[PDB]
Amino acid sequence: TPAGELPVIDAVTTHAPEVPPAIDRDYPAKVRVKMETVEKTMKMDDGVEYRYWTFDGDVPGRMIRVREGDTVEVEFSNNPSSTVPHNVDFHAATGQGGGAAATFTAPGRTSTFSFKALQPGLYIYHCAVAPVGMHIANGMYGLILVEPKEGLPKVDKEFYIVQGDFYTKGKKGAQGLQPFDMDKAVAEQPEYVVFNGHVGAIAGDNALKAKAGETVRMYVGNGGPNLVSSFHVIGEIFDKVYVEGGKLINENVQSTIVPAGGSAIVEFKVDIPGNYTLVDHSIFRAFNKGALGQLKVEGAENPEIMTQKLSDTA
Amino acid sequence: ELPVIDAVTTHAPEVPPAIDRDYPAKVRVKMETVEKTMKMDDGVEYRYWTFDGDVPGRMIRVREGDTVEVEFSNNPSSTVPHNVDFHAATGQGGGAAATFTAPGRTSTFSFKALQPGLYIYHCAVAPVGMHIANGMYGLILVEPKEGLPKVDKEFYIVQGDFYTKGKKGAQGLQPFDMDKAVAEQPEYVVFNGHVGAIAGDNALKAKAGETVRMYVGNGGPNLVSSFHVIGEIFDKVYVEGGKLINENVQSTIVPAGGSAIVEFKVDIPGNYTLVDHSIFRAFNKGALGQLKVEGAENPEIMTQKLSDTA
Amino acid sequence: ELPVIDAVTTHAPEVPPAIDRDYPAKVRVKMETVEKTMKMDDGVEYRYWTFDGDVPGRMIRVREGDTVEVEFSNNPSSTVPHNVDFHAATGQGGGAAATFTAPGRTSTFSFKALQPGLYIYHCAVAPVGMHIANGMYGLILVEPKEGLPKVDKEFYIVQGDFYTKGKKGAQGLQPFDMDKAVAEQPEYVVFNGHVGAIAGDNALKAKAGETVRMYVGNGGPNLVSSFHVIGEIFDKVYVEGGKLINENVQSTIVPAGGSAIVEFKVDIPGNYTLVDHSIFRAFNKGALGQLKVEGAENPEIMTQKLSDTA
Ligand SMILES: [Cu+2]
Ligand SMILES: [Cu+2]
Ligand SMILES: [Cu+2]
Ligand SMILES: [Cu+2]
Ligand SMILES: [Cu+2]
Ligand SMILES: [Cu+2]
Ligand code: NA
Ligand code: NA
Ligand code: NA
């Protein structure tokens, strides 16, 4: 069926950690997506600035949500102030470079192309301009969720989380604007490992929020470029894991691998209030390089699941 | 309320016996944190921080739906506080906040084991990486309500990476090296705390024809293990320690802060070698264990060298 | 006893024909270990240690329940002994002890392939890591008794990490660098022994509409691959080379000393890139292959650039 004969729907995309609403369609549609590539200076950590290359102004790019069988029409613009061309490779797309050749766009230009989402899953998209590693390492990646035809189960809370490793010339903590360091990248020796582009992006005042009793689903991406994440939530167990973001489901998992350029979906029920910490359990990444997020859960205590310190004695 | 049962815990590589119970119970566990100097390798000493005096901590075995009440003691000679985060526990820090214990003090708390699996537990005192890197980790097995299938031999194996200021082989007491840890460049990668801890005279033992199950933990702090047994194939793998079962696997990933269960039947006698198949860890950094199998040879499965010609 | 059959082995990226046998057989395999200098990249030489003259070794294909008889020769020009450990073999060293062969000698031994799967084989002479790092690894496929599903194209792909004294790009003969190996800091990461071994004029080839299966091994010694095909999605993944099947996976882990099988149908023409998606390995260290697919375009699946405006 030609895509021009399908009803046209403007995509609802979200900035991390938000997720677009679930799709209540039982028929294919032509989904129009607008993306802009912007090079901009942002805060990586306290007193540390970095020149990010972004989809739509932050890291990761905005999340896209479509249904298996949809045609995705992408209007791809590269901001005039950009120093280099950019494009996008959708791991959800079947064909040359996942769309990279069709979306090769110089600064001040706009490209359009479309692809059919043939297979459900949770797919990384990222820039593929040479040198690809640099474009990825500077923050050009995001997730597109392709729902199964029948949809996914309903859950109370959904979060959008993408891990990435960053390579600065100075050591972590070195102040000022820090340029990209190709040698550390080739050596796979990052200074920062973060969720959603920046240290503390989903921690402290920016923590994720939920209420006791709610079911939580996390769409977890790994833009890399290099590291593989042992993803874990302190204080919780994964009721379900879509292994490597695929169809296969594992259960009762404490820590699951997220491949580089890959993904995973994890689900768990937050039973009792508390502060839950997302980490890459290659643990020195979490507590020394920034691979640390927080989930605030409010509600009524339940001693039957866990008690506090009942006593301390000599 | 629930009947109270004293936990049977075991020092690696031993495993507690399977649970013959069909009802929930309150299982009492005693844990002590002890800082002590032990041998890492020939002529190399290390200041370990341990649960119950060695690395890994003692294995705990409970049943889905049990209440686990932990009596947590910190030796008076300890220099810092310690606690425990059970990946099996649901709630704040897996119990870390409730078990924050200064030297010479005892804490108690409890949690219900809601989900079966094989869960790492470890200290979570800041700086978390250092407490883990010094050896404070172990495994707790939460059986399914119906139990696990019977096997002849069960082993308790936990990999960890260690960071010494001196190069591997440097003699004497070797302090923890924060810079190498942050860089993820360990000097030692071992099973159960020390080079040779389950090799040579400390090898695991079985008999030909017996079914073997290994509960494999990875305390990290940083490395991911490509776990493999030289000379054998995994008939079953509980993927990442979860419910999903894989079969006919030669090498399986054990995530950092994660686990795996593998099963295989040892068909013929011989020495079978446990390794992290990121192989320079095994044969240069110490990630090497041995399973000695006794019994009658069988040429139909494998022969010795049949001929040597020019 | 058993009928005797001479093995059909293949040079990468080719795969032996599927087995149309419904009965067990004695499959005779001849292997020779050869040390030889070859091109790693433009103007870069390396002293490879090989099974049968290249990296990886030739692929072996047998049926579950077969007896594999190996005639193992070590070329007289070799400087050290070599052997082979089959991850498919059950028993001492996977055959390493039985095939320990000095230069100019020949060893024979046999093993029964008890379990189906896709198994790494590699040399295990001390120092094991160096023998592997110099290129001594390959794959043996043990079919299930009922065989595998039919596919149009089958490819044989093995990733390996290499450790040279000089930085990648340094011209001339590059010796093995033990220090970088222990640090797991490779200069080259390649498919099938060399930069470009399956790219450009050596690219893999298929036709639009064909189903493709890749037998993907990771000889290591150290790295774990996030295997990905740019422009495609894995319809099927035999997780870690085992019996378990995943679907709709973009990137799958290949453990060190492990394997994976992936399947996908190439719908439209184009150049598809095999990479380790630890992406600096692909575009800076050489872990890059190409699958060129010819056929008729289909804008319904993907279009070219439809417009370029201001
Ligand atoms: Cu770009
Ligand atoms: Cu990609
Ligand atoms: Cu501690
Ligand atoms: Cu933990
Ligand atoms: Cu050799
Ligand atoms: Cu091996
Ligand atoms: Na829960
Ligand atoms: Na066996
Ligand atoms: Na396809």
- The ligand whose atoms approach the alpha carbon of C265 most closely is 9
Of A238, A257, A275, the CB nearest to B253: A257
User: How many Å lie between the alpha carbon of B211 and the closest alpha carbon of chain A?
Assistant: 25
Structure tokens at A226: 């290099």
- Residue corresponding to tokens 């950009």: A82
Residue C129: in which H helix or E strand, if any? helix C128-133
Beta bridge partners of C297: none
Closest CA to A155 of A243, A246, A219, A64: A219
Q: B258 and A230: CB-CB below 8 Å? A: yes
Residue positions counted in chain C: 310
CA atoms within 13 A on the CB side of C21: 20
- The dihedrals phi and psi of A244, each to the nearest 5 degrees, come to 55, 30
Structure tokens at C261: 């099988």
Q: What three-state secondary structure class fits C93?
A: helix
Residue C82 to residue C124: CA distance in whole angstroms: 7
Residues of B in contact with C88 (CB under 8 A): 233
DSSP single-letter state for residue C82: B
CB C99 within 8 A of CB C69: no
Structure tokens at A35: 């993306």
Q: A237 and B109: CB-CB below 8 Å? A: no
- A313 close contact with B: CB closer than 8 A: yes
CB C75 within 8 A of CB C32: yes
In whole angstroms, what separates CA B235 from the centre of its chain?
20
Closest CA to B170 of B11, B46, B23: B46
Closest CA to C195 of C25, C42, C46, C308: C42
Amino acid, res. C33 = T
Of B185, B307, B308, the CB nearest to C183: B185
- The ligand whose atoms approach the alpha carbon of B302 most closely is 8
Beta bridge partners of B26: B4, B67
My answer on whether omega of the bond before C149 falls inside 30° of 0, hence cis, is no
DSSP single-letter state for residue C10: B
Q: What three-state secondary structure class fits C181?
A: helix
- Kindly give, in sequence order, each residue whose CB lies less than 8 Å from that of residue A291, ignoring residues fewer than 6 positions away: A163, A193, A194, A195, A229, A279, A280, A282, A285
User: How many Å lie between the alpha carbon of A89 and the closest alpha carbon of chain C?
Assistant: 8
CB B59 within 8 A of CB B138: yes
CB C114 within 8 A of CB B265: no
Residue A184 to residue A182: CA distance in whole angstroms: 6
Beta bridge partners of A66: A146
- C217 close contact with B: CB closer than 8 A: no
Residues of A in contact with B87 (CB under 8 A): 232, 237, 254-255
Q: A230 and B255: CB-CB below 8 Å? A: yes
Q: What would the 3-class secondary structure string for chain B be?
A: CCCEEECCCECCCCCCCCCCCCCCCEEEEEEEEEEEEEEEECCEEEEEEEECCECCCCEEEEECCCEEEEEEEECCCCCCCECCEECCCCCHHHHCCCCCECCCCEEEEEEECCCCEEEEEECCCCCHHHHHHCCCEEEEEEECCCCCCCCCEEEEEEEEEECECCCCCCCEEECECHHHHHHCCCCEEEECCCCCCCCHHHCEEEECCCEEEEEEEEEECCCCEEEEEECCCECEEEHHHCCCEECCECCEEECCCEEEEEEEECCCCEEEEEEECCCHHHHHHCCEEEEEEECCCCCCCECCCCEEEC
Amino acid, res. C294 = E
- C222 close contact with B: CB closer than 8 A: yes
Binding residues of B for Cu(2+): 82, 85, 87, 122-123, 131, 136, 277
Q: What angle do CA A231, A237, A243 make, to 5 degrees?
A: 55
Q: What three-state secondary structure class fits C168?
A: coil
Residue A162 to residue A222: CA distance in whole angstroms: 5
- How far is ligand 5, taken at its centre, from the CA of residue C260, in Å? 24
- Kindly give, in sequence order, each residue whose CB lies less than 8 Å from that of residue C153, ignoring residues fewer than 6 positions away: C204, C206, C210, C211, C212, C213
Residue C143: in which H helix or E strand, if any? strand C137-143
Structure tokens at C4: 């005797």
| Strand order through the sheet with A208-211 | A208-211, A292-298, A274-280, A229-234, A256-258
- Residue corresponding to tokens 């992406």: C279
| Strand order through the sheet with C245-246 | C188-191, C153-162, C211-220, C258-265, C236-238, C245-246
Residue A301 to residue C39: CA distance in whole angstroms: 66
- The ligand whose atoms approach the alpha carbon of B102 most closely is 3
CA atoms within 13 A on the CB side of C301: 20
Partners of chain C (3+ Cβ pairs below 8 A) = A, B
My answer on whether omega of the bond before B24 falls inside 30° of 0, hence cis, is no
- C210 close contact with A: CB closer than 8 A: no
CB A125 within 8 A of CB C300: no
My answer on whether omega of the bond before B149 falls inside 30° of 0, hence cis, is no
Structure tokens at B264: 């295989």
Residues of A in contact with C209 (CB under 8 A): none
Residue B227 to residue B221: CA distance in whole angstroms: 16
Q: What three-state secondary structure class fits C262?
A: strand
Count CB-CB contacts under 10 A for residue C104: 12
Of C99, C182, C256, the CB nearest to B226: C256
Q: How many domains does chain C have?
A: 1
Q: B127 and A271: CB-CB below 8 Å? A: no
Amino acid, res. A225 = P
CB B115 within 8 A of CB B243: no
Residue C226 to residue B85: CA distance in whole angstroms: 30
Count CB-CB contacts under 10 A for residue A280: 31
Residue A209 to residue A204: CA distance in whole angstroms: 11
End-to-end CA distance of chain B: 77
Q: What angle do CA C274, C278, C284 make, to 5 degrees?
A: 75
Q: B251 and C258: CB-CB below 8 Å? A: yes
Residue B230 to residue B213: CA distance in whole angstroms: 15
- Kindly give, in sequence order, each residue whose CB lies less than 8 Å from that of residue A27, ignoring residues fewer than 6 positions away: none
With 0-12 / 13-18 / 19 or more C-beta atoms within 10 angstroms meaning exposed / middle / buried, residue A48 is buried
Resolution (Å units): 2.3
Q: What would the 3-class secondary structure string for chain A be?
A: CCHHHCCEEECCCECCCCCCCCCCCCCCCEEEEEEEEEEEEEEEECCEEEEEEEECCECCCCEEEEECCCEEEEEEEECCCCCCCECCEECCCCCHHHHCCCCCECCCCEEEEEEECCCCEEEEEECCCCCHHHHHHCCCEEEEEEECCCCCCCCCEEEEEEEEEECECCCCCCCEEECECHHHHHHCCCCEEEECCCCCCCCHHHCEEEECCCEEEEEEEEEECCCCEEEEEECCCECEEEHHHCCCEECCECCEEECCCEEEEEEEECCCCEEEEEEECCCHHHHHHCCEEEEEEECCCCCCCECCCCEEEC
User: How many Å lie between the alpha carbon of C16 and the closest alpha carbon of chain A?
Assistant: 29
- B235 close contact with C: CB closer than 8 A: yes
Residue C142 to residue C66: CA distance in whole angstroms: 9
Residue C135 to residue C197: CA distance in whole angstroms: 14
In whole angstroms, what separates CA C241 from the centre of its chain?
12
Residue C133 to residue C86: CA distance in whole angstroms: 17
Residue C138: in which H helix or E strand, if any? strand C137-143
Give rounded-to-5 percent helix, strand, coil for chain C.
Answer: 10, 45, 45
Q: What angle do CA C163, C167, C170 make, to 5 degrees?
A: 110
Binding residues of C for Cu cation: 82, 87, 122-123, 131, 136, 277
- How far is ligand 7, taken at its centre, from the CA of residue A213, in Å? 9
Beta bridge partners of A192: A166
My answer on whether omega of the bond before B13 falls inside 30° of 0, hence cis, is yes
Residue B282 to residue C308: CA distance in whole angstroms: 55
User: How many Å lie between the alpha carbon of C293 and the closest alpha carbon of chain B?
Assistant: 32
- Residue corresponding to tokens 């896209």: A64
- Kindly give, in sequence order, each residue whose CB lies less than 8 Å from that of residue A74, ignoring residues fewer than 6 positions away: A33, A34, A35, A88, A99, A103, A112, A113, A114, A115
In whole angstroms, what separates CA A55 from the centre of its chain?
12
- B135 close contact with A: CB closer than 8 A: no
* Range C168-180 burial, b when 16+ CB lie within 10 A, else e: beeeeebebbbeb
B240: left (phi over 0), alpha (psi -120 to 50) or beta: left
Which residues precede chain breaks (C–N over 2.5 Å) in chain B?
none
Distances (CA, A) of A53 to A56, A59, A86, A184: 9, 8, 9, 18
Of C226, C250, C308, the CB nearest to A111: C308
Distances (CA, A) of A249 to A229, B43, C244: 18, 47, 11
CB A41 within 8 A of CB A83: no
User: How many Å lie between the alpha carbon of B201 and the closest alpha carbon of chain C?
Assistant: 18
Q: Could you tell me the CATH number of the domain that includes residue B223?
A: 2.60.40.420
Structure tokens at A135: 């474009």
Structure tokens at C201: 């004029």
Residue B16 to residue B143: CA distance in whole angstroms: 12
- How far is ligand 3, taken at its centre, from the CA of residue B130, in Å? 8
CB C49 within 8 A of CB C131: yes
CB B215 within 8 A of CB B139: yes
CA atoms within 13 A on the CB side of B304: 3
Residue C284: in which H helix or E strand, if any? helix C280-285
Residue A108 to residue A86: CA distance in whole angstroms: 11
Residue A33 to residue A20: CA distance in whole angstroms: 13
Longest dimension (CA), chain A: 77
Test the B interface: residue of C30, C182, C238, C278 with most B CBs within 10 Å: C182
- B100 close contact with A: CB closer than 8 A: yes
Distances (CA, A) of A222 to A153, A193, A195, A228, B239: 23, 11, 9, 8, 20
Count CB-CB contacts under 10 A for residue A103: 28
- Kindly give, in sequence order, each residue whose CB lies less than 8 Å from that of residue B170, ignoring residues fewer than 6 positions away: B44, B164
- How far is ligand 5, taken at its centre, from the CA of residue B126, in Å? 46
CB B58 within 8 A of CB B9: yes
User: How many Å lie between the alpha carbon of C107 and the closest alpha carbon of chain B?
Assistant: 5
- Residue corresponding to tokens 């070329």: C75
The dihedral sign for the CA sequence C146, C151, C152, C156: negative
Structure tokens at B161: 């990476």
My answer on whether omega of the bond before C13 falls inside 30° of 0, hence cis, is yes
Structure tokens at B205: 């033992």
Domain that holds residue C185: 1-310
Q: What angle do CA A149, A152, A158 make, to 5 degrees?
A: 135
Residue A75 to residue A88: CA distance in whole angstroms: 11
Residue C249 to residue C156: CA distance in whole angstroms: 20
- Residue corresponding to tokens 């189960």: A153
CB B220 within 8 A of CB B186: no
Residue C282: in which H helix or E strand, if any? helix C280-285
Closest CA to A280 of A211, A210, A153, A195: A195
Amino acid, res. B196 = G
Binding residues of C: 82, 85, 87, 122-123, 131, 136, 277
CB C89 within 8 A of CB C115: no
CB A243 within 8 A of CB A264: yes
Structure tokens at C284: 């800076």
CB B230 within 8 A of CB B181: no
Residue A150 to residue A152: CA distance in whole angstroms: 7
Count CB-CB contacts under 10 A for residue C207: 12
- The dihedrals phi and psi of A82, each to the nearest 5 degrees, come to -65, 145
Beta bridge partners of A74: A33, A113
Residue B1 to residue A293: CA distance in whole angstroms: 38
CB B189 within 8 A of CB B158: no
Residue C36 to residue C54: CA distance in whole angstroms: 9
With 0-12 / 13-18 / 19 or more C-beta atoms within 10 angstroms meaning exposed / middle / buried, residue A56 is middle
- Residue corresponding to tokens 């883990």: B132
Closest CA to B222 of B252, B178, B263: B178
What DSSP string runs through C16-62?
PPPP--SS--EEEEEEEEEEEEEEEETTEEEEEEEETTBSSPPBEEE
CB A238 within 8 A of CB B263: no
Amino acid, res. A153 = P
Test the B interface: residue of C74, C244, C246, C278 with most B CBs within 10 Å: C244
The dihedral sign for the CA sequence B246, B248, B253, B254: positive
